[PDB]
Each structure stands twice: as C-alpha cells, then as structure tokens.
Amino acid sequence: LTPNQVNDELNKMQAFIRKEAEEKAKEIQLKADQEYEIEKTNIVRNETNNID
Amino acid sequence: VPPSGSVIDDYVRNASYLEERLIQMEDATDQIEVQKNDLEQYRFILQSGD
Amino acid sequence: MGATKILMDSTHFNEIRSIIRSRSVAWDALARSEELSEIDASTAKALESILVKKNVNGKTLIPLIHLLSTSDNEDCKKSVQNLIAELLSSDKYGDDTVKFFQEDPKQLEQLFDVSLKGDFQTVLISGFNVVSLLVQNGLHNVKLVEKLLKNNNLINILQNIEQMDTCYVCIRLLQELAVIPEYRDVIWLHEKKFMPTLFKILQRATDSQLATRIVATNSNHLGIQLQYHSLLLIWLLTFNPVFANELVQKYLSDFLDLLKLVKITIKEKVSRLCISIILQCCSTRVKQHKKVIKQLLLLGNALPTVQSLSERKYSDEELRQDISNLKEILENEYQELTSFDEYVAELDSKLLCWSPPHVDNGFWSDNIDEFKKDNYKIFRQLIELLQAKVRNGDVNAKQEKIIIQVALNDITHVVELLPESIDVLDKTGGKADIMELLNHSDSRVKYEALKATQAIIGYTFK
C-alpha cells in the first residue's frame, strides 16, 4: 500500500539479487581455474608420454 | 495443509513408494485369496468324492 | 590501488566495523600518556582525512604498523586496522598503501603478528587485511596461513556458532585463502579443526523448517551465505583427488546430510555446491570412486535425490549439468559391475545389502544357470546362510534383518524365476523358517518373506 514498504522491499530484493548474482558468479571461474589446471596437466602428461 | 514450503519430489516419492508396495500387496492378496479359495473349494470336493 | 573486495561487501563485516566506527580514539592522548609515539599519533590522526578527503597510505603505512605493533590497545589497533582496511579496499583513496604491502613483505609479516591479540574483532580486521594482500599474486606466504590456522584464538573465535560475523568472517577468510593451490595443502592439514563447524552450520540450517524463520538462517542471505561459504570451503578442498577420497571416507557420515540440505533448501547456491561436491567426489579421477559412489549412493541415497532433482531443475545450467553429469556416472556406476561377481562377492563376504541391480529379476535369471553347479548349491548356500543367520543370531536384530530381507528378496526372485529351486529349499530346510519369519516383526521383511513364500506357493497350485 505505502511506497516506503515497496521501496524497502525492492531495495532489499535488488541487493539480494545482486549479491546472489555475484556469489553465484564467482563459482564459474572458481571451477574454471581447476579445470584449466587439470587440462594443462593432462596436455602436459600427453606431451611427456611421447617425449619419453 | 502444511504451513511450510512445497516439496514435489518428497511428496511424490512417499506416495509412489507406498502405492508400489500397495499394488503388489493387493495383487498378492487377491492371488493368495483366489488360490486359497480354489484349494479350499477343491479340498472338500476331493474329500467328498473320495 | 585496486584490491579485491572479497569479504568486504558482506553485512557481517560492516556490522562489526560499525561498532568500531561508532567509537572514537584519540592518538594524541594515548601518545601523550606514554602508550605510543607522537609521529604515529599524528600520522594516525592525519590518516583519517585521507579517506574522506581523498575520495598516501604507503608513506603512513610504516607508522601505523609500528604504532599498532608497539601499542597494546584493541581500540586504537582496531580503529587503525579498520581505517587501513577501509582505505586499502577503496579504489579512489590510499592507492599507495596496497603497493607498499605487496612490495615489502616485512610490513605484512609484522602486521600479521599483531593479529589474534586483544578482542576478536581486531584479529578479523588484521586477518582480512593480511588475507587481502596474501590473496594477490605479489606475495604468497603459506607460513602465515599455516600459523594462523595453527592458532587457538582463530579456531576459538571461528568455533563459536553464536556469532554469524565471526564464523562467517573466519570461514570466509579460510575460504578465500583456500582458492590458491599452494594453500590447499596447509589449509588441508589443519582442516580437521574447522571441519565440524562447516557441517554444524549446514545441520543447523537444515534443522530449521519452512513455517518459521530462524534468527541465524532459514531462508535469509546470512545463513545461505554461511552455508554457501562452508559448502564453498569444502568444495575448494574437494578439488584435490586424495582430499576428496580421504574427506569422503572420513567425514562421509557428516557429509551425508549434504543431499538432504540441497533438497530441503530452495536456493541453488547451497544445492549447487552440495550437488557439485558429490559430483566432484564421485569423479573417476579420485581414488576408490566405486567405494565412495557405492557408500554414498547406498547410505546417502543420492540416486533418488538426483533423479527427483533432475526433473525439477534450477535456473542455473551448471546445476542441471552437474546433476545430469553425476546422475549418469552414479547410475552407470552400479550397472557397470557384473551381477555374478557382485552376488558371489556379497554372498561370499557374508554381508547382504540392497543395490540398484539387486532388485532386478534379470540378474538372478542370468546368474541362475551359472550358479547351478552342484544341484543348486549356490542357492542352497544362500538359503543356508539366511537360515543359519536366522538360527544363530535370531530375528529382531539390526544385523540379521538386512541379510534376512536381502536374502528373502533374492530368494523370492530366484524362487519366482525358476520352478526347480523349490526342491533345494525343501531339501535344505530353509522353507520352514520362511513361514515363521513372516509373522514376526520387521513387516517389510515379512512382506519380502511373504512374497518369497507366495512365489513358491504359486508353483504348487495353479
């Protein structure tokens, strides 16, 4: 009814959506670093097998 | 009606797990009742005919 | 400047920083009282105007560290560490303070020695400032992370579950420090102390229902951020192959509630890290993945939660790809084994248990011809194991009930499969205990023995 409750609810909903978006956003690079390290280790072993 | 949140998988598994045993219990009860009624129906006929 | 804002935009750090920002500290009165130097009080008093007036921390960085190391007050060190931590994280005031910390490691090593003393809020402020410069590529000190993890004040402050800011900042500091691959070994060595606090926060959030809103966390961002920080901290340590097998083999009982935590929770943050932790632990790169997948699938029941969770997907594609990727390896993991080696290994091991391939009639029909080598000596050995377990080790027990139920289900499927196995049960003598086992307790096992007796009773009269 009042605009203060809708402004506080939208202000909390926007900050919660932004914090959930960033906190859900960090895991992509957080897993992508270990995936890139695993791919680099697999390529390094794949080259080291033929090198040996 | 519960005042908490909605769970479709937990409510579906508790009903499918009960219905899956209830169908086999009803079919086994009907087959055991038909076999017991057939053997009990034929036992007095065999004993009377003997 | 341009430092990372990890552990700086949360309300828990701003709530503890607001209490130190509410009070005022006079460096001139403390320096005049023989408690500090005049240059450190003048630089500390002049350093406050650089924050609001700017928006040089590198020039005044040495007097604040020397005054903080020489001083023994928690209010002055908490205010100077809060002002230096607030000026370091900003990108428009005090840019030279961040370069001076990465350039000289003696200021970070001397600043890390002042942590853990006084109040618990100063240890999080100094640990956040040392963890901010330690997380960069300029300085990598594993001795500060191992020494901070070996401290009793940090484990005592993080062990307190009554404060969301202390456990959230302490778990967020170890979670941010665990992102580096070199700190995973030192953080993994002392993970046994902070390991129960991550599962206790997930059990406390899982214990809260949906009708009422708990004060710590039930659907709030504080409990979801603490449980997401604990699941992200366990997910960071779960990236190692030996750490996932050792942690899954050691803490599988406390880690078994992660499937119920993602099912009871509605957000994809805790369910995504919970399904991603089980999917990463169930990978083929980890050693002994069949035992962890069999113990986690049998004890944890990840197959029904993954199958029901596959239909009710989330908005994120990583959760559906992780649940769909883990469901194929979890479903194909039990189906990939042979039924004759699993039935001969389970019957030879004297331990009966349920499985996905043990409730199928095709396994007993396929192994029925191979088991028949001594006039059905395999089924007579299984019926002699079930009846010998029924005689020695009587019913109404926990151990004999699982082997009696699995032996009654496998004996009911093997007896219902072929009509020639009924002579082995009457010749051995286990058919008499099957009728008496139905009238006892454990009515599920009495229904399995009722189906096993109905299968042999069906072939007698048609």
Curated annotation (Swiss-Prot), chain A:
It is found in: Vacuole membrane. Its main location: membrane. The keyword Repeat does not apply. GO terms for biological process: endosomal lumen acidification; Golgi lumen acidification; proton transmembrane transport; vacuolar acidification. Subunit of the V1 complex of vacuolar(H+)-ATPase (V-ATPase), a multisubunit enzyme composed of a peripheral complex (V1) that hydrolyzes ATP and a membrane integral complex (V0) that translocates protons. V-ATPase is responsible for acidifying and maintaining the pH of intracellular compartments. Present with 16134 molecules/cell in log phase SD medium. This is V-type proton ATPase subunit E.
UniProtKB/Swiss-Prot annotation, chain B:
Glycosylated. Residues 18-46 form a coiled coil. It is found in: Vacuole membrane. Present with 55714 molecules/cell in log phase SD medium. V-ATPase is a heteromultimeric enzyme composed of a peripheral catalytic V1 complex (components A to H) attached to an integral membrane V0 proton pore complex (components: a, c, c', c'', d, e, f and VOA1). Subunit of the V0 complex of vacuolar(H+)-ATPase (V-ATPase), a multisubunit enzyme composed of a peripheral complex (V1) that hydrolyzes ATP and a membrane integral complex (V0) that translocates protons. V-ATPase is responsible for acidifying and maintaining the pH of intracellular compartments. Is present only in vacuolar V-ATPase complexes; enzymes containing this subunit have a 4-fold higher ratio of proton transport to ATP hydrolysis than complexes containing the Golgi/endosomal isoform and undergo reversible dissociation of V1 and V0 in response to glucose depletion. Belongs to the V-ATPase 116 kDa subunit family. This is V-type proton ATPase subunit a, vacuolar isoform. The chain holds residues 100 to 149 of 840 of the full protein.
UniProtKB/Swiss-Prot annotation, chain C:
Its main location: membrane. It holds the Pfam family V-ATPase_H_N. It is found in: Vacuole membrane. Gene3D superfamilies: Leucine-rich Repeat Variant, V-type ATPase, subunit H, C-terminal domain. It is a peripheral membrane protein. One of its GO terms (biological process) is Golgi lumen acidification. Keywords: Hydrogen ion transport, Ion transport, Membrane, Transport, Vacuole. GO terms for molecular function: proton-transporting ATPase activity, rotational mechanism. The keyword Chloroplast does not apply. InterPro entries: ARM-like, ARM-type_fold, ATPase_V1-cplx_hsu, ATPase_V1-cplx_hsu_C, ATPase_V1-cplx_hsu_C_sf. Disruption phenotype: Increases the ATPase activity of membrane-detached V-ATPase V1. Abolishes growth at pH 7.5 and in the presence of calcium chloride, abrogates growth at pH 5.0. It comes from the Eukaryota. Belongs to the V-ATPase H subunit family. Present with 22500 molecules/cell in log phase SD medium. This is V-type proton ATPase subunit H. It comes from Saccharomyces cerevisiae (strain ATCC 204508 / S288c) (Baker's yeast). The lineage of its organism: Eukaryota, Fungi, Dikarya, Ascomycota, Saccharomycotina. The gene is VMA13.
